[PDB]
Design an enzyme around this catalytic site. Structure first.
Site, PDB file in Angstrom:
ATOM      1  N   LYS G  25      15.960   5.626  -0.314  1.00 41.63           N
ATOM      2  CA  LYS G  25      14.528   5.904  -0.358  1.00 41.63           C
ATOM      3  C   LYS G  25      14.012   6.232   1.030  1.00 41.63           C
ATOM      4  CE  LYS G  25       9.930   4.920  -0.262  1.00 41.63           C
ATOM      5  NZ  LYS G  25       9.118   3.844   0.380  1.00 41.63           N
ATOM      6  N   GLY G  28       7.862   6.538   5.277  1.00 46.11           N
ATOM      7  CA  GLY G  28       7.358   5.886   6.486  1.00 46.11           C
ATOM      8  C   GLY G  28       7.457   6.737   7.740  1.00 46.11           C
ATOM      9  N   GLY G  61       2.984   9.532   1.224  1.00 42.70           N
ATOM     10  CA  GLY G  61       1.580   9.121   1.347  1.00 42.70           C
ATOM     11  C   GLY G  61       0.645   9.888   2.280  1.00 42.70           C
ATOM     12  N   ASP G 180       9.789   3.267  -4.036  1.00 41.63           N
ATOM     13  CA  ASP G 180      10.734   2.137  -4.010  1.00 41.63           C
ATOM     14  C   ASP G 180      11.168   1.772  -5.429  1.00 41.63           C
ATOM     15  OD1 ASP G 180      10.527   1.906  -1.164  1.00 41.63           O
ATOM     16  OD2 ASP G 180       8.911   0.449  -1.333  1.00 41.63           O
ATOM     17  N   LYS G 239       8.763  -4.676  -1.842  1.00 46.85           N
ATOM     18  CA  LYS G 239      10.079  -4.125  -1.487  1.00 46.85           C
ATOM     19  C   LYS G 239      11.238  -5.033  -1.899  1.00 46.85           C
ATOM     20  CE  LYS G 239       8.472  -1.012   1.989  1.00 46.85           C
ATOM     21  NZ  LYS G 239       9.070   0.286   1.551  1.00 46.85           N
TER      22      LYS G 239
HETATM   23  N1  ADP Z   1       9.150 -11.295   6.748  1.00 53.34           N
HETATM   24  C1  ADP Z   1       8.787 -10.003   6.941  1.00 53.34           C
HETATM   25  N2  ADP Z   1       9.651  -9.105   7.472  1.00 53.34           N
HETATM   26  C2  ADP Z   1       9.304  -7.820   7.674  1.00 53.34           C
HETATM   27  N3  ADP Z   1       8.090  -7.319   7.366  1.00 53.34           N
HETATM   28  C3  ADP Z   1       7.120  -8.105   6.825  1.00 53.34           C
HETATM   29  C4  ADP Z   1       7.429  -9.527   6.577  1.00 53.34           C
HETATM   30  N4  ADP Z   1       6.325 -10.078   6.045  1.00 53.34           N
HETATM   31  C5  ADP Z   1       5.390  -9.099   5.965  1.00 53.34           C
HETATM   32  N5  ADP Z   1       5.852  -7.920   6.422  1.00 53.34           N
HETATM   33  C6  ADP Z   1       5.046  -6.661   6.445  1.00 53.34           C
HETATM   34  O1  ADP Z   1       5.313  -5.865   5.285  1.00 53.34           O
HETATM   35  C7  ADP Z   1       5.236  -4.476   5.618  1.00 53.34           C
HETATM   36  C8  ADP Z   1       6.183  -3.642   4.758  1.00 53.34           C
HETATM   37  O2  ADP Z   1       6.178  -2.277   5.184  1.00 53.34           O
HETATM   38  P1  ADP Z   1       5.270  -1.128   4.499  1.00 53.34           P
HETATM   39  O3  ADP Z   1       4.197  -0.740   5.490  1.00 53.34           O
HETATM   40  O4  ADP Z   1       4.885  -1.541   3.096  1.00 53.34           O
HETATM   41  O5  ADP Z   1       6.350   0.071   4.416  1.00 53.34           O
HETATM   42  P2  ADP Z   1       6.024   1.532   3.814  1.00 53.34           P
HETATM   43  O6  ADP Z   1       4.675   1.901   4.386  1.00 53.34           O
HETATM   44  O7  ADP Z   1       7.166   2.377   4.330  1.00 53.34           O
HETATM   45  O8  ADP Z   1       6.025   1.327   2.316  1.00 53.34           O
HETATM   46  C9  ADP Z   1       5.556  -4.382   7.101  1.00 53.34           C
HETATM   47  O9  ADP Z   1       4.699  -3.417   7.716  1.00 53.34           O
HETATM   48  C10 ADP Z   1       5.334  -5.780   7.655  1.00 53.34           C
HETATM   49  O10 ADP Z   1       4.209  -5.812   8.533  1.00 53.34           O
HETATM   50  C1  NLG Z   2       1.182   4.587  -6.469  1.00 47.97           C
HETATM   51  C2  NLG Z   2       1.473   5.078  -5.281  1.00 47.97           C
HETATM   52  O1  NLG Z   2       1.068   4.519  -4.274  1.00 47.97           O
HETATM   53  N1  NLG Z   2       2.209   6.195  -5.236  1.00 47.97           N
HETATM   54  C3  NLG Z   2       2.321   6.828  -4.047  1.00 47.97           C
HETATM   55  C4  NLG Z   2       3.642   7.583  -3.953  1.00 47.97           C
HETATM   56  C5  NLG Z   2       4.174   7.715  -2.533  1.00 47.97           C
HETATM   57  C6  NLG Z   2       5.158   6.622  -2.169  1.00 47.97           C
HETATM   58  O2  NLG Z   2       5.527   5.774  -3.016  1.00 47.97           O
HETATM   59  O3  NLG Z   2       5.573   6.622  -0.991  1.00 47.97           O
HETATM   60  C7  NLG Z   2       1.217   7.371  -3.474  1.00 47.97           C
HETATM   61  O4  NLG Z   2       1.086   7.351  -2.224  1.00 47.97           O
HETATM   62  O5  NLG Z   2       0.323   7.896  -4.190  1.00 47.97           O
END
Ligand code: ADP
Ligand code: NLG
Ligand code: ATP
Ligand code: ATP
Ligand code: ATP
Ligand code: ADP
Ligand code: ADP
Ligand code: ADP
Ligand code: NLG
Ligand code: NLG
Ligand code: NLG
Ligand code: ARG
Ligand code: ARG
Ligand code: ARG
Ligand code: ARG
Ligand code: MG
Ligand code: MG
Ligand code: MG
Ligand code: MG
Ligand code: MG
Lengths: 126, 281, 283, 126, 126, 283, 281
Positions: G25, G28, G61, G180, G239
């Site tokens: 996947k 980011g 996104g 994801d 995740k």
């Molecule tokens: N134990 C942990 N280890 C790593 N990240 C964590 C933890 N707890 C919370 N987080 C947060 O969860 C977030 C997960 O990343 P996210 O921004 O959702 O990724 P993406 O935007 O690629 O989907 C991280 O930015 C981090 O700040």
């Molecule tokens: C529901 C949802 O947030 N889907 C995403 C798809 C992109 C991704 O998963 O990185 C969105 O940004 O609209």
């Protein structure tokens, strides 16, 4: 007597696949006319023992193809089934099989609805 | 331009049984009439072109009777089954395989498809055994086994199988088999979606007399009660029994339909009403 | 003795391997089918060839079987240069006898001999397309071969079925035609690019003199047989027999033989020995 | 009562393969929500009887494809299971099936560790 | 005690197929040396629950691939088998499995004819 | 009546079997997609052709769908001889509208109609390789078809998927190009050795006079259409439409038709009747 | 000449997962940087050429947000998931499938491999159902089923699948699915060796703050306790849950890795240390 007492027992035999035809034939001869088989995998790992299947060696954890025979009968004919299976299935080599005996509380024929002794009886066993 | 809007509306009916095997027994008044005959052929070909996998099984009684009386060995029937000695057997195979079978195959070939005509002998498709009343009937057979192996590549190449209801036992003695029986047991062997029998009546009637009491849909338990109660009789009893027999073996539906009706086969498959009685498993 | 019999079996090895994997069209003539024992002996020879690695295709006739039914049904019969004059009534009878009696008899015998056969007429899978002969006004519904489509034979042979071919077919409009079984066998051999065409009949082979069964010609070429037709030495049913050899040889079939189907195991004597068992025609 | 007395029983039904969907559907309707099936081979050769499968005939020794259904339930719901299977599976033809009833001493859900009655209960059965 | 009292019991576990190697390995470690497995289909549909298999959702009536483990042992080692299976098979997700315990009246080794305790004993379990 | 409807279905038989097993490239023009009901009607016709034994490949456009987004985003639009002037910003928007809206709309409609579709752009499986046109200085990122690689379509069709093709692609360096959907449909038909190319649009067919919808030319040859371009009778989006027929016919496609996608079941009227439903061009 | 002695040393790492399916996947910071982007592409292609069977699943996104604000319909997010009405859904599909998907496919095609880009619609690869919070979120979907049929011949022909995370329900309504989720459920459908998620952090941290407390390897029971104890929070909870979900379904390992690192994908697969947290079944 078999300790959990019951009117019927299931004889469950896990044996070599290539012996099924012979055991089935021999069971038919003594009036055993209801038999179920299915393909299974198993291991029976005594001590350091090694089992041969497909020209290969199998120790402990490693699974080997077998067939499971299931025969449901009245209490009195259980010994004849066990003995008939042993004679038909035995080679003398490691991995010849295990037999289990389990109590069965009832037998029902789907076509008629006959319960118990009538359902177990097959009209050609003597 | 009404022809194409109708074609468009039959889409969901065409999609429903795509890739499914359908076993059709052709006989009776549908055989004796050249107009009905070409309609059956048409319907078969259409079904094949439209994605279904049809198989045609035929009898051919009247043609046999004609040659038997030409040869001064006239027909003898007991409870709808022909007494078949060695001489009669030869004539039966001659007519069913050499006349009827090749007639249907050639008609299909001329209709823009391609057929292959087979008897039970061919590819050992069927093996017969003497029927329970063989002492009175002679070389009349039950189906001891079906080997559908030979049909696999023929259907894969897009040929339409056309089956004549004679076969041999394991020693090589030819037997005369009821075509309904062959169709039912063949359907069971193929795990067919449908068995369809063309007869000389509207279907299964609530009352043996009036044709307005036609039963549209009924199950095994339903018609089995109708036999016991005597509501169905005569030549219709063997037909229902062959339907039950193949249904019990996994065939999804079995229909007894009016062969006297133009395009009855298409009516049965391409409409919700059908063309007679549907029996469900 | 058992010690001697086994070494004789192993002496057949070079003969077995010589035509391994080769397509052989065997035509079993109606005139040769004089006995139930001989019928099952001939299918035995044919089955043996399949089991031993060859690819036999069986074509058959049935002239005498047809003739018997015409007699019973009170229908006059007539032949001209080995071809049956065939009106509409006779066509129906030809088809029923050849396909419904003889074809299924042979299919049935093969199935009882440890093999599996599939019987086909020219109709089936559109194996043959017929065409009326020029002299329709005299011969009636007698056909020539307009097309061979060997497609239906491919999956059947791939599955290990021995095909058994009856010599009736239709034109494109669905009108049935009677084709001489020799003609069919010869055109089928050409369609399959067959190594050999072998025709079993009721004489030793091509005879220099019809009357004298010891005037067997052991081998002859295309020039030689054409001359025998023109000189009148070849007559009746032997004309189409000889003509199907000429036509198939011209289309790339390597050898054609005419042999006595009433001699025990003659098919084997022809293939599995240097002498053969009748007449071989070559290009 | 079922002679070997127990809190639970396993209903073991060997039936025709093409009936499984219908029996499963009908069992779901009366609140039976745990079912296990597997492919098996068998023969049930009464008297001279001949069984039909795939358009072919099967006598005595010759094996026929079947499916084995296993349903574990409380003692009180055993009769409803048997009856529901019979209605769903019966054709009236030879070879419709055999049902066996066997005692089960305990039931355990892997995810939670719940034993006995709690492990047997599925939160949607009335 | 297990209510139908018996010298032996069969532990029957229906679990996820990809866990079989791990459970078998762990059972081998505590001296369990006889194991039978077979491929099955099943559903365990609690309430509104939805189960995931092959990335897809399965509710009520819809069958999911599983493996059936069968282990026959003495009464006293039954708890160790159950616990070992649970530790090896549990993910915490819906559809982790069901375990059944059934009484077994006798055990017989085909090769020797040994009955009961001798037949159950494998010469390397401590 | 039910008795009459069923015999009308069976009257379609000779029309069904006439092009059985033939590859037909159907181009569904953007201008024709004026209604949700008409969109699902057209995919109905396309699905019907697959179920009935033909091999349809769907190509689509989406000019008006693009135009709507340019308006919303405040971007000027321009066309010259039926081709969009395409700068870098417009390219991105062209690709997102055609692939992300229209392609998946059609794929989705086909999946809901009892069939299964697979949507591809020229990028996917390297189906198309683009090349800049000579007048890049005026047209910008407008492409010509440099190569078609039909390989990705073989396993998809073998599995019974109906391909749905969007008309964007890249050159070998990965630069994206906007290709007119007519041009794509025509070159794809040539690559597949298609029997027919059929283009659905928003007019009855090629009109002798743009203003007069009753000046439908029912059939015409290559000489005739080339003359209409030179005389100026064919203009705007009808130029690439007509040009893709010339090019595909020259490469062995047997017939090309231009028809009204807004007439109900027009695709069926074109194939399943002697009159057709618009203009047929022949060699 | 140091380039080939290094190549030689990576042999056992290349052999280990030959023929195995790997689901990656991509999202980011690995998306927003052209340098990281070409490294991911490179790594994918290398893995394909070296005998692995990689599948790329993307989100996208930031690109969506940009067009939404151009159109004066700015983004709304609830707990990391986008509120998606019918208008937003159209833009989401436009960007993910028409921009991002075809961008990645063209970059792979130019890197000397060949890609095929697919959404959940194509070959009915995915069927969606409304997510539990659909009342607030609109057309946001869970994966109701995966049909991996279409991927079989594409992978056999040596194409690299590139998957966009939109799909329809059975009636034809388009849904927006978390990438994801699509990656995890796709891995489960294929019985994949590995699920690899690129994120904007080092991996799973013992302490939410300092990046030196990175956990190298942990099991289902381990991280499930970390959720309950609150040691992992925010966007990292969904995740881990997707990792557990696919692990429970037979995927062997699931890794959450640092997309900010050059060649992170190669680091994860071609070294013993990895590039983040490995979660085992
Ligand atoms: N134990 C942990 N280890 C790593 N990240 C964590 C933890 N707890 C919370 N987080 C947060 O969860 C977030 C997960 O990343 P996210 O921004 O959702 O990724 P993406 O935007 O690629 O989907 C991280 O930015 C981090 O700040
Ligand atoms: C529901 C949802 O947030 N889907 C995403 C798809 C992109 C991704 O998963 O990185 C969105 O940004 O609209
Ligand atoms: N205790 C048990 N529980 C469940 N299944 C068993 C058990 N013991 C044996 N089996 C099954 O029986 C099969 C074959 O018998 P096996 O050879 O394992 O018996 P054994 O006790 O090792 O005797 P031998 O010393 O002759 O090998 C095994 O592969 C396994 O499937
Ligand atoms: N005594 C038995 N032990 C084990 N399995 C059995 C027994 N009886 C039947 N079966 C299984 O059930 C299957 C089908 O039931 P079956 O028709 O054999 O029962 P039946 O007693 O012969 O009743 P019917 O007279 O209706 O045939 C068999 O093929 C076999 O697999
Ligand atoms: N009562 C039962 N009888 C027979 N088999 C069962 C029974 N319950 C479960 N099974 C089998 O065990 C399998 C998996 O366990 P399952 O998840 O169904 O248990 P559960 O009670 O629903 O627990 P969970 O809530 O964890 O799902 C089922 O697919 C089925 O094959
Ligand atoms: N309930 C019933 N419904 C329909 N037909 C019935 C019923 N009971 C008896 N019959 C009779 O059974 C016969 C079955 O047809 P039959 O002549 O055997 O067909 P075929 O000659 O095509 O084999 C009908 O002619 C009909 O008179
Ligand atoms: N020169 C010849 N040599 C051998 N046979 C001949 C010759 N000329 C004519 N015949 C006749 O041809 C017959 C063989 O052809 P035919 O009667 O059609 O038998 P088949 O069933 O083998 O076709 C022989 O029985 C013989 O009467
Ligand atoms: N001679 C002609 N006949 C018909 N249409 C024409 C002609 N010349 C120009 N046109 C224009 O071409 C248009 C079709 O092309 P286009 O607008 O690109 O639609 P599509 O989406 O089908 O490509 C018609 O709507 C019409 O305005
Ligand atoms: C036994 C028997 O009656 N066979 C049939 C076959 C024809 C048919 O079934 O229609 C017969 O008339 O001889
Ligand atoms: C035309 C013709 O002679 N047909 C042949 C076919 C049979 C055979 O050749 O043996 C016949 O006797 O009627
Ligand atoms: C170059 C060009 O005209 N592209 C087209 C493609 C769409 C269509 O043909 O409908 C366009 O409108 O942008
Ligand atoms: N009673 C009947 N004849 N019903 C026919 C049902 C018709 C339906 N189209 C089918 O073929 O399945
Ligand atoms: N006169 C003959 N018939 N000769 C036959 C030659 C034999 C040789 N084995 C062959 O078929 O080729
Ligand atoms: N003017 C026309 N559009 N004619 C169409 C000819 C119709 C014919 N069925 C075809 O596709 O070949
Ligand atoms: N904690 C980790 N990231 N471990 C990665 C393990 C690396 C190993 N080469 C694999 O891919 O399986
Ligand atoms: Mg052992
Ligand atoms: Mg002759
Ligand atoms: Mg029985
Ligand atoms: Mg469950
Ligand atoms: Mg245009």
């Amino acid at each position: 007597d078999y300790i959990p007492d019951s009117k019927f027992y299931k004889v469950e035999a896990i044996v070599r696949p290539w012996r099924i035809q012979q055991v089935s034939s021999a069971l038919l001869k003594i009036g055993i006319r209801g038999v179920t088989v299915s393909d299974v995998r198993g291991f029976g790992a005594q001590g350091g023992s090694t089992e041969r299947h497909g020209g290969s060696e199998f120790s402990e954890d490693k699974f080997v193809a077998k067939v499971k025979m299931e025969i449901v009968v009245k209490k009195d004919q259980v010994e004849s089934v066990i003995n008939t299976i042993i004679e038909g299935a035995r080679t003398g080599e490691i991995g010849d099989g295990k037999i289990f005996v389990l109590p069965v509380s009832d037998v029902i024929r789907v076509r008629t609805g006959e319960r118990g002794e009538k359902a177990e009886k097959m009209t050609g066993d003597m | 331009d009404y022809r194409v809007e109708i074609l468009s509306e039959s889409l969901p009916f065409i999609q429903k049984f795509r890739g499914k095997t359908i076993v059709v027994k052709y006989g009776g008044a549908a055989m004796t009439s050249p107009e009905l005959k070409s309609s059956v052929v048409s319907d078969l070909v259409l079904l094949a072109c439209v994605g279904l996998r049809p198989i045609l099984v035929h009898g051919g009684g009247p043609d046999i009777n004609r040659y038997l009386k030409q040869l001064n060995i006239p027909a003898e029937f007991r409870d709808g089954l022909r007494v078949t000695d060695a001489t009669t057997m030869e004539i039966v195979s001659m007519v069913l395989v050499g006349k009827v079978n090749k007639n249907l195959v050639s008609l299909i070939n001329a209709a823009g498809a391609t057929a292959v005509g087979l008897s039970g002998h061919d590819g050992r498709l069927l093996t017969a055994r003497p029927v329970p009343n063989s002492a009175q009937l002679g070389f009349v057979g039950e189906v001891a086994r079906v080997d559908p192996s030979v049909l696999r590549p023929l259907v894969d190449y897009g040929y339409i199988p056309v089956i004549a209801s004679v076969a041999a036992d394991d020693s090589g003695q030819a037997y005369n088999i009821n075509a309904d029986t062959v169709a039912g047991e063949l359907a069971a062997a193929l795990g067919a979606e449908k068995l369809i029998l063309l007869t000389d009546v509207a279907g299964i009637l609530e009352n043996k007399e009036d044709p307005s009491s036609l039963i549209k849909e009924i199950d095994i338990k339903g018609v089995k009660k109708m036999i016991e109660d005597g509501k169905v009789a005569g030549g219709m009893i063997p037909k229902v029994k062959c339907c039950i027999r193949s249904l019990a073996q996994g065939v999804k539906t079995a229909s007894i339909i009016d062969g006297r009706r133009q395009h009855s086969l298409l009516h049965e498959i391409m409409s919700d009403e059908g063309a007679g009685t549907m029996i469900t498993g």
